[PDB]
């Protein structure tokens, strides 16, 4: 029939085409009810604080605080030297350095060879 749509990581699967959207178990309905209950509880708390007339300031967001903490200060305590981390770190932190070193050293060696052989167009190169 119609050509199928293949989702990617940068073009995800639409909800209307998700197979799980048309196969609803009774437990799925109670999961959705629990999710709505959690959202409603959080919404009620935020709205009460928001509409409080005596509140002056910023409603601190525990979720935002957890996010900013986990992004920076929680990374090193939870890092372990593994083969994957070691290889990725060595690659991403050493390979570019030596690649650029090889490129620049080769270029400058060729330039110096031309300078010594005296066949490089260096006229008008007054500023250096």
């Amino acid at each position: 029939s119609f050509p199928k749509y293949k989702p990617s990581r940068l073009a995800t699967l639409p909800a209307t085409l998700d197979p799980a959207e048309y196969d609803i178990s009774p437990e799925t309905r109670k999961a959705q009810a629990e999710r709505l209950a959690i959202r409603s509880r959080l919404k009620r708390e935020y709205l009460l604080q928001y509409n409080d007339p005596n509140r002056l300031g910023v409603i601190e967001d525990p979720a935002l605080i957890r996010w900013t903490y986990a992004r920076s200060a929680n990374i090193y305590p939870n890092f372990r030297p593994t083969p994957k981390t070691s290889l990725l770190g060595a690659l991403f932190g050493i390979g570019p350095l030596f690649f650029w070193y090889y490129v620049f050293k080769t270029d400058r060696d060729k330039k110096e060879k031309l300078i010594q052989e005296g066949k490089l167009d260096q006229t008008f190169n007054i500023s250096y």
Partner: protein
């Protein structure tokens, strides 16, 4: 004008063709030039005349500093700090003067190209040769001294160049 030296900053004689109109139509450029002279040039000339009259009542003069020559780093003994200081200061002043010489030649080149316009490739060959020679000499003198350049480093470079020239001459004569 007497503001600058015509020999240092040459300008070819200006050949402006005489107007030869062929139509009875009025010239808007001529009319607008007359308007510009009447409205702008006369008031600015009067203002400058007043300013120059006020200047002539308070005429005072300023002078150009002259530095007598001093022995150079070749004459200075090894680790003779005072002679080295005098020679280094003299070399720095000479470096500045040479830079301004190159600047003057470059200004000549630019002005000549603009003046010649569409025939610059042929009519600016005279100024291109002078610039080539001056830039070549300046580059050989001060090409790769570095950020911490000094009279000693320039002298060492000159010694290296002289040794190379002597070796080349000997090889050619061989």
């Amino acid at each position: 004008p007497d503001s600058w030296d015509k020999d240092v900053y040459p300008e070819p004689p200006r050949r402006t063709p005489a107007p030869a109109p062929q139509t009875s139509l009025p010239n808007p450029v001529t009319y607008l030039t007359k308007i510009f002279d009447l409205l702008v040039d006369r008031p600015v000339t009067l203002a400058r005349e007043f300013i120059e009259q006020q200047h002539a009542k308070n005429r005072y003069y300023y002078y150009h500093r002259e530095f007598r020559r001093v022995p150079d780093i070749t004459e200075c003994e090894e680790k003779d700090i005072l002679c080295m200081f005098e020679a280094e200061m003299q070399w720095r002043r000479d470096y500045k003067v040479d830079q301004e010489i190159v600047n003057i030649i470059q200004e000549r080149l630019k002005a000549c190209q603009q003046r010649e316009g569409e025939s610059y490739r042929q009519n600016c060959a005279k100024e291109l040769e002078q610039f080539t020679q001056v830039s070549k000499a300046f580059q050989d003198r001060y090409s790769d001294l570095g950020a911490h350049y000094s009279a000693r480093k320039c002298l060492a470079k000159q010694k290296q160049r002289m040794l190379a020239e002597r070796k080349a001459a000997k090889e050619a004569a061989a």
